[PDB]
């Protein structure tokens, strides 16, 4: 499969999440995603086909993981924006107030601004600390997916947010949204990963 931020993948033939970003670990191909999407060794599929397995994750506390892919997968420095793409150009972290977008299999490509840093989410499984908050909308299944600026700076991976009874927070105003992502930089260093860029 072609590995593009925001696309769907399944975990053990069960849950669906979204790809974060193509990465390498030495010779090993991978993608980063959210930790709550799978346990170590869980099987990832795209397009009906096995593409790899969860190599490592931290969740709760953090919310991060990477999927170690077979060599047959095609890593790409891209995030889905409708039928188009946003090129991944680096991992510079944006400040509060910056515009940012996110991509995922439920709500597609959505944009807003960064409103706060170092936010704690109290999820079912436990607290997750250190999250960045934006007011782009999202919904269930967008977890793991890319957060990126239009200028191509990869920010992090979708963790959670204040989804409403319809499964998303797109039906409330931006001022009322809390959409939380796990910062990319600590994921990259904890697992020794390099971001695929173009």
From Swiss-Prot:
Source organism, top-level taxon: Bacteria
Protein name, per record: Alpha-lytic protease
UniProt family annotation: Belongs to the peptidase S1 family.
Disulfide-bond pairs as recorded: 17-37, 101-111, 137-170
Parent sequence residues shown: 200 to 397 of 397
Gene from which this protein is expressed: alpha-LP
Active site positions: 36, 63, 143
Provenance organism: Lysobacter enzymogenes
């Amino acid at each position: 499969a072609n590995i593009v931020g925001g696309i769907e993948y399944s975990i053990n033939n069960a849950s669906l999440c979204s790809v974060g970003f193509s990465v390498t670990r030495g010779a090993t191909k991978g993608f980063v995603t959210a930790g709550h999407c799978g346990t170590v060794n869980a099987t990832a599929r795209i397009g009906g086909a096995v593409v790899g397995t969860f190599a490592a994750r931290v969740f709760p506390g953090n919310d991060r993981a990477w999927v170690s892919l077979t060599s047959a997968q095609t890593l790409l420095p891209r995030v889905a924006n409708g039928s188009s793409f946003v090129t991944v150009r680096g991992s510079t972290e944006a400040a509060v107030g910056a515009a940012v977008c996110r991509s995922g299999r439920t709500t597609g490509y959505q944009c807003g601004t960064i409103t706060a840093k170092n936010v704690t989410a109290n999820y079912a499984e436990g607290a997750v600390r250190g999250l960045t908050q934006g007011n782009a909308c999202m919904g269930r299944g967008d977890s793991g997916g890319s957060w990126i600026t239009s200028a191509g700076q990869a920010q992090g991976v979708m963790s959670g947010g204040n989804v409403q009874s319809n499964g998303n927070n797109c039906g409330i105003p931006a001022s009322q949204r809390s959409s939380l992502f796990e910062r990319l930089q600590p994921i990259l260093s904890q697992y020794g990963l390099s971001l695929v860029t173009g």
